[PDB]
Amino acid sequence: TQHTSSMRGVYYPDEIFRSDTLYLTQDLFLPFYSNVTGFHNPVIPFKDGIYFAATENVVRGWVFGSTMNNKSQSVIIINNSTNVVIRACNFENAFNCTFEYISDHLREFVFKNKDGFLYVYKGYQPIDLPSGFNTLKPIFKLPLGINITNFRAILTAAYFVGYLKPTTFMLKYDENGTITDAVDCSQNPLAELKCSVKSFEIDKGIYQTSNFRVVPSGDVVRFPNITNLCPFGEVFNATKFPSVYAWERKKISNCVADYSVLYNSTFFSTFKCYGVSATKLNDLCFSNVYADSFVVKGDDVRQIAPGQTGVIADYNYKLPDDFMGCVLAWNTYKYRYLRHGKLRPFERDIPLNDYQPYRVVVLSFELLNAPATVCGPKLSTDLIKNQCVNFNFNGLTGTGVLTPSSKRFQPFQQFGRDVSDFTDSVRDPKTSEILDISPCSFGGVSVITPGTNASSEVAVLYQDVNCTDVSTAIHADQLTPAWRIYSTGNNVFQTQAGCLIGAEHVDTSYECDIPIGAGICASYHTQKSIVAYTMSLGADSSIAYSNNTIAIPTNFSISITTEVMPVSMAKTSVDCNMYICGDSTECANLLLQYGSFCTQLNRALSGIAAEQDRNTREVFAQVKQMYKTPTLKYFGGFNFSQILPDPLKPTKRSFIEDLLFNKVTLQYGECLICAQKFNGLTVLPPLLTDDMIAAYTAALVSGTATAGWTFGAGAALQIPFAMQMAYRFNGIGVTQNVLYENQKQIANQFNKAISQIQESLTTTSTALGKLQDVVNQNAQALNTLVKQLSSNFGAISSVLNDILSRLDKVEAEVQIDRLITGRLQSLQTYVTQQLIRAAEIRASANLAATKMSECVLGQSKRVDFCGKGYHLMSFPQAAPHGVVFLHVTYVPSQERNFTTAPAICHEGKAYFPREGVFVFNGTSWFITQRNFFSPQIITTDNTFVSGNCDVVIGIINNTVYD
């Protein structure tokens, strides 16, 4: 039979206490929900380890071997009802053996074998195979030295066998220190998303996780038609050589060169190759090889090198300082000594001094400026077109697809290049056909999820591909992020952003929820599913233009809206010697060589810290005098109880401010007892406490409700609230009688809007997303900075104390220099990004100060500056790191249609309205204001006369009262 191993067989990775962490590690783990083969005693393979479990006493011991005969060592881990016995001999009597160890319900084991060690882990659990999660602890590792490719149980019969694979797990550690939960980061797209964001519960949105590749299939080698074997025998085993002043040069071409007859022997005294290595010469393909052969003294062979001095390398034989080639000499004749001037490289002169001798041969490789001729024995294969392969064209390697081309090469050219030095076309050395080279498919991978509290389904966007490509690559199992439990399905949709696998296409346009790209969104609609539509810009209407009709409102409504303004962020200092070095002194002296880094960095961070307090002072400290909150909070019917503090409570905040402070959900050292951390990171406290900001906003609300608008320009002057509201109605263009006659209705609409503001903040909707975004960005910057202290940047370890306790001084200098360089770079990145984010926060605080001046201390005429409507009055409330503005506006809401005229002609002269419009009641002509319907009779007081009535287009006849 076969069963599944659901979340079983996880073990403790190492021997270190951890608590309240999530830990990402790579080891050999049994993947989640994989197959097991239950037995109800065959020889079973042992590949990279197993997972053995036995539900029933009757099973005891194992035999781990290679051949399972008397010709290979085999280990027996048996139990004689009291003693665990381990032996490693040639069993079938035993002989010739090197290990011995005797020592004094579901049982579970993991056997792993690596580096000549057999790790064994064991767990126990009291209950086919169950479905729980259980964790395994180590028992013993044994220093055996044998391969294990088979195993067999020993019975004196219900056991299951899994198989381990190299995976990545994210392990959750308790507060006590035990592993309670884990995710397999290669099982689903969602599990990869959980591992990449390092959390178990994902929010809603679109997230980028990894990148995809299309792996190669074939392999293409093309080499020229060269058959003749190559004559190094003539060049090397030759009877006579010329003198060093008259060296000879021999050209080698159209030969297949072995090169293994030079470095397989001790025949040569020296073997120095420049620009290549000896072992790599059997794959490269050169154009011609030249051999310079001569005879020279013993202690002058060192002189034959790039950049030497003397007589041989000065008047006899000079090499250039870009030499690609090999220099040979072995134990076995004049030489020039006087001439006028130096030599140019590879030039000879035909004053001579006579000469243990050595024979020297110098090989220079002509590298691929022409068709290649001289290269080693590699086989050639046919070429594969329109497919991702690995190629090798005369030593020129790579990976990509090959396509017929339309370029036209000159006969002396062998390949074609690009701007960043990529070969993008090539000539086939056999058929002389031009091929283009393209990359295989790659890009990013996005995971679209509706939160991991409403579904566990996701969709995947493969960015910027045609996805018959990724459909065929998935079905042929050829993508690098290959997920074990994942089916493409029948929902594959091509967009301009790439293509979308897992979301279905509907024809109904909705407002955008999760944006994907070029007009496409996704959402979670009706079970439910993930849909993908074209976004809708707005809800349509039609208003009919006519040349003699106007629409005038017949009522209104009061609306209170909200604005969230971030103002400041959290203030940070870092100890540069504690982050970079710690307690060490060799590190301190080594870091002293870099000038002023830490002084300059502390200066930058201090400036950011001072700027945050300046922002807060600029927004809130805008009043000269502190007005006390009134005893009675009922001004003409307007209830101010929810925006002013209550004397019957211990705190200064109001009730809405309490909601706002509960809304935002806010390591490193900081204090309030005062603790510190080993990384040298703190957070500094602000100059103005929450109580002082609450005192500011309380005095602003009190001064508004008592003096109105007059304290932003001079001293405050008291005025009853209804007369203040009548002046504000007058300022938006409505007469005061509209207030005074409908005062009760306006008070009721105010109170109801305040109650809805309260209830919508209690509802736990994320209206405060900006202040949360401030919190999140700062925390993730500091987490990246602390996590950068685990990398070693090339050193043997990332710990300075290990390097300093296990190594001498002279190499500890090298390792500490590498760690110092990497950590200076990490701190520089942190400070640069903090400066840019401080600029953002300062612009936002400047806007908030402009709004407090122009909307709390006045009445603004600017359209949509302070709410949506006609602005009346506005109120400030404090939040964590911000301010919330409660704008009160006037909305004209009902309509009627009327017939209108520009002027009316009475006797011979035309009358125009003073302030208003002429409307037709249905019976007679009245005059009314624009923003409310209040018809008045047309008199001489509210009209003016200018001209004759023959010139205005659309003038009518009506009487005008005197």
Ligand X SMILES: *[C@@H]1O[C@H](CO)[C@@H](O)[C@H](O)[C@H]1NC(C)=O
- Is 853 among the residues that bind ligand X (CB under 6 A)? no
What length is written for the chain?
962
Task: Provide the 3-class DSSP secondary structure of residue 429.
Answer: coil
Residues 684-703 that bind ligand X (CB under 6 A): none
Q: Which does 762 bind (CB under 5 to 8 A by kind): ligand X, a copy of itself, none?
A: none
Choice between 757 and 838, CB closer to ligand X:
757
Among a copy of itself, ligand X, none, partner that 634 touches (CB below 5 to 8 angstroms by kind): ligand X
Cα–chain center distance at 909: 76
Among 129, 146, 448, 820, binds a copy of itself (CB under 8 A): 146
Interface with ligand X in residues 555-584 (CB under 6 A) = 555
Choose the contact partner of 957 out of a copy of itself, ligand X, none; CB within 5 to 8 A by kind.
ligand X
Stretch that binds ligand X, among 244-252, 278-286, 633-641, 700-708 (CB under 6 A): 633-641
Q: Which is nearer to ligand X, 683 or 952 (CB)?
A: 952
Residues 341-360 that bind a copy of itself (CB under 8 A): 344, 346-348
Options 176, 487, 527, 542; binder of ligand X; rule CB under 6 A: 176
Pull the structure tokens for residue 435. Answer: 């091929």
17 or 412, CB closer to a copy of itself? 412
Q: How far is the CB of 410 from a copy of itself (least distance, A)?
A: 7
The entry of a copy of itself, ligand X, none near residue 290 (CB within 5 to 8 angstroms by kind) is: a copy of itself
φ, ψ of residue 82 to 5 degrees: the values are -140, -25
Give the integer Cα–Cα distance in Å for 487 and 484.
9
CB of 147 to a copy of itself, least distance (A): 6
CB of 465 to ligand X, least distance (A): 37
Q: Is 339 in the site for a copy of itself (CB under 8 A)?
A: no
Instruction: Name the amino acid, one letter, at 725.
Output: M
* Cβ 138 to a copy of itself shortest distance, Å: 6
Residue 156 binding partner per list ligand X, a copy of itself, none, with a CB distance cut-off of 5 to 8 Å that depends on partner kind: none
CA distances from 838 to 568, 693, 727, 844, 884 (A): 9, 21, 41, 10, 20
DSSP 904-919: EESSSEEEEESSSEEE
Our finding on whether 251 is near a copy of itself (CB under 8 A) is yes
Q: Which is nearer to a copy of itself, 413 or 472 (CB)?
A: 413
- Euclidean distance between CA atoms 767 and 885, whole angstroms: 13
**Is residue 249 close enough to count as binding a copy of itself by CB under 8 A?**
yes
Q: Return the residues of window 711-770 that contact ligand X according to CB under 6 A.
A: 745
Amino acid at the residue 635: F
Q: Do 893 and 559 meet the contact criterion of CB atoms below 8 Å apart? A: no
State which residue, 145 or 377, has the beta carbon closest to a copy of itself. 145
**3-class secondary-structure state, position 163:** strand
How far apart (Å, rounded) are the C-alpha atoms in residues 418 and 437? 12
How does DSSP classify residue 200?
Answer: S
Contact between 408 and a copy of itself per CB under 8 A: no
Binder among 47, 114, 137, 896 for a copy of itself (CB under 8 A): 137
Instruction: Give the Cα separation of 406 and 435 in Å (integer).
Output: 8
Tokens matching residue 879: 């939040």
Asked if residue 641 binds ligand X (CB under 6 A), the reply is: yes
Q: Which is nearer to a copy of itself, 213 or 250 (CB)?
A: 250
How far is C-alpha 175 from the geometric centre of its chain's CA atoms? 29
Q: CB of 179: closest distance to ligand X in angstroms?
A: 12
Residue 137 interaction partner, one of a copy of itself, ligand X, none, beta carbon < 5-8 Å per kind: a copy of itself
CB 905 within 8 A of CB 911: yes
* Tokens standing for residue 841: 């926060």
Nearer to ligand X, 676 or 749 (CB): 749
Instruction: Please report whether residue 634 would count as binding ligand X according to CB under 6 A.
Output: yes
| Residue 271 binding partner per list ligand X, a copy of itself, none, with a CB distance cut-off of 5 to 8 Å that depends on partner kind | none
> Does the footprint of ligand X cover residue 527 (CB under 6 A)?
no
Check residue 147 for interaction with a copy of itself (CB under 8 A).
yes
By a kind-dependent CB cut-off of 5 to 8 A, residue 138 interacts, out of a copy of itself, ligand X, none, with: a copy of itself
Instruction: Based on the shown chain and the rule CB under 8 A, indicate whether residue 603 belongs to the binding site for a copy of itself.
Output: no
When binding is defined by CB under 6 A, the residue of 174, 234, 321, 511 that contacts ligand X is: 174
d(CA 856, CA 858): 6
Residue with Cβ nearer a copy of itself (105 or 251): 251
DSSP structural state of residue 31: P
Q: Which H or E run contains 25?
A: strand 22-29
Picking from 22, 111, 104, the residue whose alpha carbon sits closest to that of residue 64 is: 111
**Which of 38/416 has CB closer to a copy of itself?**
416
> Which of 81, 277, 527, 923 contacts ligand X by CB under 6 A?
923
From the list ligand X, a copy of itself, none, pick the one residue 249 interacts with, judged by a Cβ distance below 5 to 8 Å according to partner type.
a copy of itself
Pattern 881-920, a copy of itself, x by CB under 8 A: ----------------------------------------
Rounded Cα distance between 325 and 335, Å, is: 24
Contacts of 871 (CB under 8 A, 6+ apart): 732, 855, 859, 860, 861, 865, 887, 888, 889, 890
39 by Cβ neighbours in 10 Å (0-12 / 13-18 / 19+) ranks as: middle
Task: Decide: is 526 part of the binding site for ligand X (CB under 6 A).
Answer: no
Task: Select from a copy of itself, ligand X, none the partner in contact with residue 42, using the beta carbon and a kind-dependent cut-off of 5 to 8 Å.
Answer: none
HEC assignment per residue over 343-405: CCCCCCCCCEEECCCEEEEEEEEECCCCCCCEECCCCCCCCCCCCCECEEECCEECCEEEEEC
CA 147 to chain centre: 42
When asked if residue 415 is in the footprint of a copy of itself (CB under 8 A), the reply is: no
Which parts of 14-139 fold into alpha helices (H)? Answer: none
* Residues within window 95-154 making contact with ligand X, judged by CB under 6 A: 147, 149
Q: Does 596 bind ligand X (CB under 6 A)?
A: no
Taking each helix axis from N to C end, the angle separating 769-787 and 809-851, rounded to the nearest 10 degrees, works out to 170
From 45, 116, 132, 145, residue interacting with a copy of itself (rule: CB under 8 A): 145
Beta carbon nearer to a copy of itself, 345 or 607: 345
Stretch that binds a copy of itself, among 340-348, 617-625, 639-647, 676-684 (CB under 8 A): 340-348
Separation between Cα atoms, residue 245 and residue 294, nearest integer Å: 8
CA angle 305, 311, 315 (to 5 degrees): 90
Query: Cβ 643 to ligand X, closest distance in Å?
Result: 10
Name which of a copy of itself, ligand X, none residue 832 binds, using a CB cut-off of 5 to 8 Å depending on partner kind. Answer: none
The closest of 864, 230, 822, 215 to 579, measured between CA atoms, is 822
What are the CB-based long-range contacts (under 8 Å, 24+) for 477-482?
478/214, 478/215, 478/217, 478/388, 479/212, 479/213, 479/214, 479/215, 480/212, 480/213, 480/214, 480/215, 481/192, 481/210, 481/211, 481/212, 481/445, 482/186
Candidate ranges 292-300, 316-324, 341-349, 705-713; the one touching ligand X (CB under 6 A): 341-349
273-302 residues in contact with a copy of itself (CB under 8 A) are: 290
Interface with ligand X by CB under 6 A: which residues?
A: 147, 149, 174-176, 225, 341-342, 344, 430, 555, 634, 639, 641-642, 745, 921-923, 957
Interface with a copy of itself by CB under 8 A: which residues?
A: 137-138, 143, 145-147, 249, 251, 290, 344, 346-348, 410, 412
